[PDB]
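User: Can you model how magnesium ion sits in this protein?
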Amino acid sequence: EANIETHGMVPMNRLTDDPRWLPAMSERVTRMVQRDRNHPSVIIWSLGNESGHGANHDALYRWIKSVDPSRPVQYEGGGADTTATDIICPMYARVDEDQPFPAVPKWSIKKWLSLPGETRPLILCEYAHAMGNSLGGFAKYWQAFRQYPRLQGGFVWDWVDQSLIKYDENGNPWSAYGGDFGDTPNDRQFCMNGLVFADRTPHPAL
Amino acid sequence: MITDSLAVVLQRRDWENPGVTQLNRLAAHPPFASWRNSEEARTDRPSQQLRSLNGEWRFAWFPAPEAVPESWLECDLPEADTVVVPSNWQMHGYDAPIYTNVTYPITVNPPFVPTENPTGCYSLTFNVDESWLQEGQTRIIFDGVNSAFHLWCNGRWVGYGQDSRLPSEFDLSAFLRAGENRLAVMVLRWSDGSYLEDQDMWRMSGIFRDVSLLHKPTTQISDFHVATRFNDDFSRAVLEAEVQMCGELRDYLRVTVSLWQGETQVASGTAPFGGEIIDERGGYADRVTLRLNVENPKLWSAEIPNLYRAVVELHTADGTLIEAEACDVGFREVRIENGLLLLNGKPLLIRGVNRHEHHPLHGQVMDEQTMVQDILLMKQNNFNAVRCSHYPNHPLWYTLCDRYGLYVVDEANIETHGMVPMNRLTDDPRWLPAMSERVTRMVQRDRNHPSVIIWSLGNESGHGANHDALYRWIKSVDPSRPVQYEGGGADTTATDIICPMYARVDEDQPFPAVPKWSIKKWLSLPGETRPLILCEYAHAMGNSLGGFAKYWQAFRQYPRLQGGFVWDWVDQSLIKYDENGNPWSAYGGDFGDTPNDRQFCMNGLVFADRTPHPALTEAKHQQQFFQFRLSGQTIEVTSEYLFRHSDNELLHWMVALDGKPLASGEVPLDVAPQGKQLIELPELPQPESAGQLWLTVRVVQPNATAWSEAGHISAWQQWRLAENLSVTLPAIPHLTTSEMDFCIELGNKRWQFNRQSGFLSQMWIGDKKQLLTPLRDQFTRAPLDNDIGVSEATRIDPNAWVERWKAAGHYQAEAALLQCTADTLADAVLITTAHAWQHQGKTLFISRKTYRIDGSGQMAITVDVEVASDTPHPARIGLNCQLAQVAERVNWLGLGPQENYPDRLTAACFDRWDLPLSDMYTPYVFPSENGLRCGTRELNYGPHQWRGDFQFNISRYSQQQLMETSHRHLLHAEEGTWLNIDGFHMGIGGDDSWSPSVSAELQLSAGRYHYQLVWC
Amino acid sequence: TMITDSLAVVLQRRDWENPGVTQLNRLAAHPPFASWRNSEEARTDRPSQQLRSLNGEWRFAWFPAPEAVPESWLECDLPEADTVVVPSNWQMHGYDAPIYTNVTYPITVNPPFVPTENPTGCYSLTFNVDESWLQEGQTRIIFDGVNSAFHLWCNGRWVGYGQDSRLPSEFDLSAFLRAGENRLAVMVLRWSDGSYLEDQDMWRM
Ligand SMILES: [Mg+2]
Ligand SMILES: [Mg+2]
Ligand SMILES: [Mg+2]
Ligand SMILES: [Mg+2]
Ligand code: NA
Ligand code: NA
Ligand code: NA
Ligand code: NA
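Assistant: Here's the modeled complex, given as structure tokens:
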């Protein structure tokens, strides 16, 4: 994945639809492709994460397809099925229930496969958010994956908790999350979504 | 202060860095004027907020940027001169302009440029009103600077900027003071951007476009796009207006968009700011989209350029106007459907031409008067489209094309022709930012102009991944126009249109990696579905445009061949002055310029001062919008117009025996677009006198238009009607023979045949001689530019026609007499001669002639010529003599009135023509063979008459002098008048000027030739 | 030549608040290279003597803003600089707090400007170069990752600038190095215009 994410813009594509930011985005994509194109383990290029959909994304998708046609390109931006992706790659789309949001609906993956004119494979870039005591309904995803040929799986969110170690007055270490360092406005325990603890001890959901 | 100094500013060498293409430059936008009154914006009055800085500036030239003294930043140098801006400093003698075609004018080592980098220092001292500095924002706009510059205001460094053909704008609000202000501009001739500006043109520099100051309010319109959508039959249209604002959002702000058709408002819309939901994060708060419904809109096209006026008002809820902008709106839809380029649902036929911005006196500075003259001439010669040759043009050009009706191809300023392998930069991701700037800024500037129908990604830069990226970017941002690009074989993935350069009609050109198929074959290659429009064809170098009619036959026959753009409109010649002060036209190398490409800068259909070449009439004839068919005695007229009825058209017809007119008439034209009208001629006369009858028709526009005067002839055609072969029939000339001459008398005429040479050496009328040079065979012509055909000045070609002719010895062949015999018939004298032209013992041609002098004084000449099959086919077969007389007028019965060649005679008409002797010479800047008239049955010079079926030219310059003289101003008239009469003449070619291009059937490849001439 | 290497000149053009300038004097990207002078060593992937790791002990000093850095840092190590291990995040040594934010940017949103209170980390390393390296060929320094933008000095001379935090930045040091002892100075800025493209849901260090 290229190092591009503009989640905090309003709208999300304010920078990625602006030609003045095209040089910086292009550097971030082209330098990654130049560095990593010889590795056999790399099977898919990704254009970034949560930056809306802008013309810069279409330009960089076409650039990658021109320079390295041996790997498909994916991108979850404005709706996960735009012209800048070879793979429908929704984030947290549910198995059977639709989530109609304006301009970027999250269809159920089964329904998504058969929308008129849609022929691409579907691989979820993020699913089964593993926050704390979680991963309920995982078996439904995997039943769906095995039943449908064009549902080719997904990537769980995510591997390891992002907790940091602090020490008490006795010097006993303890795991800290957002806000425990006095940090400017924070998002508390949402930094811990892992299947394993920060020291790589498994959670039960694993 | 230390960081504003030259030592610091120049240290980073921003002009040798592809990563830095500008510093502190504002975003691109459509043209703004910042009207504070809605009526003024609607009527397009001059705005008081837009102030022109054009005028007198101070200028100083330096050999390198390091040579500039630090005092220039605070006060004007004593040695600075005063010059007019805009201008190129090469047109003032500070350093030489350079004409190079492909090879870069500097050593190829990107991104570095030579240390000897000529530098132009411009300074202007001006005054600013206090109201401008009290509120709002003041920006300076440089429409064009070649090729990179640094900007200082009042001694403080402002910004940098690179691209030479697009505007650069900088915010001056924090730098200006009340009263007197000084700007300092340091302009560099070479930069890393020069590597992307390798176009085939004169290389100049300076502030060559307008400079202005614009004042805007703090809360302002920053951008607006207009888009039009239609229903199936174009009865309903929706005008899509998206407006963007800068400043502070307030709830009381509103945007009004009103559409005006001349004087009446046809639609209007008002809304507060805040767009539709875009994504998970919401929508644009600082944008508003206005939708306007238009009933039965008038559609824009080149034939009928209907325009609306759109006014965008930023105002408060109470009704107080803050700022207004405006643009011309044309309702038209361009799309490719099923392999055809359609405009408003109809397939286009492109009658285009490539046009550089060039003025012989001011170089590359463009003005409104020259642009208007160019547009008028193009429309008067049946062109309906123009290709901006390899860079964006002056902003007024698109407005004029909108108003007068021309389709425009807008090209980004990218050309890397001089790289090896030509895509070295365009396949490199490090150059992607600079190319992207050059494309995206042009699209942002020009996307609202209805005349722009196609985007182009540049010219001759190979094919790289950067091209694919930018193609996709344009398709994403502006899907209303197709994108084309020729580089890398003309049919790559970065083009919607197959756009080859100089592809031939029927002959393939198989180059290894980028073959040039014939266009007909190209259309049907497996898997190919796109339309084909040639971006360059029919190279118009000098005496050229042979074979043009073949291109236009192909265009009309094949639906997916939708036309092309001729190369090119105007010669790129510059004016120099001799020691007497007489101006003359100069081309490459005439300024001492570093390696140059000589006369290849002159490929125009018109001279640099906009005087037409003869090829322009051939172009006008082949491109005409009415086509004619004759099936006795009915003329069928077919309109090639797509949208307009023939309401300003009158058909004149005439029948002549020699002209000598016999009958004529007038019929109004009433034909629908792509329709047909049958015109029944009245009973045509049937004279019993011998001769060929000719029917000529012409379409005349009786009413003046915005681009033409009353009586303009737009189309014509001619046919042969009926022939009556002459079946009728007509003192004894005295022959005196001496060992040196055969001499014949008849009354007061005498002919002298030199027995040693075997040629007619002298003719007498009374006691006055008629010849300065004997009458002899001629097999050569002064080589045309197509004959020389050597693109680069250093790349010699042994396959060029002139090289083959030289190597075979055609220009040095010596005539050897084989026979010279005289006999006295019952009523005539018969002279028989034979000659052989030989080169190092090889016989090239053999000529056998009979001269028959009868009792009526006429000399009948019969010529039979044999050409060796292994020699290159000769340029001409004919006769040549220098006449003693110099007469004032030339009168002939044949094709005319203009110069025409066997390759280029479809526009000439058979009639009786009379012209001054000066009109019989076409003054091409590089002298060559010129002024031929084909299909001639009779020629009248002063006392003489020649009759037969021949081609002739007649002038004061011999073929040898034209061959040996490199500039037209160095030609000197000879003592008498040179006459060439040819039985046969080779074609001129013109598909390109760097390879042989004369089709096989216009070559003199027959083994034997015969022609007959009567001299009375 | 010295005036243009100074902090005043180098920092005057605020390259970290400019989306048009993402690097200065940075070399082209390429797949990983080791420059083996023996084919067997390359085949068996032995350590190469031409690739030298500078990881270890560096001198570090924290500043609240880039303007607060004294000009003496460019020629000699500051008395108040500590010794830290590299690679490392300076938030894991107590110099300033790490910030965890999911969506909302950690700075005020106004692309491309960043706050004037821009925490700055000054790294310096004193090292030695073999004469054979400086006799021929080309010597480059490779920064696998720097968060989030930095200016580079070698022996008091300004070398270059780089932004993207997750990809390597390489600079040619052939013209800047001398025989024997050499000093590198790296000024690392926490926020830059590139931070606007790095709004991932993770700890900001
Ligand atoms: Mg530059
Ligand atoms: Mg070229
Ligand atoms: Mg920057
Ligand atoms: Mg996110
Ligand atoms: Na499956
Ligand atoms: Na999270
Ligand atoms: Na056609
Ligand atoms: Na040319």
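A couple of observations from the model: The radius of gyration of chain C is 18 Å. Chain C is about 10% helix and 30% strand.
User: Helpful, thanks.
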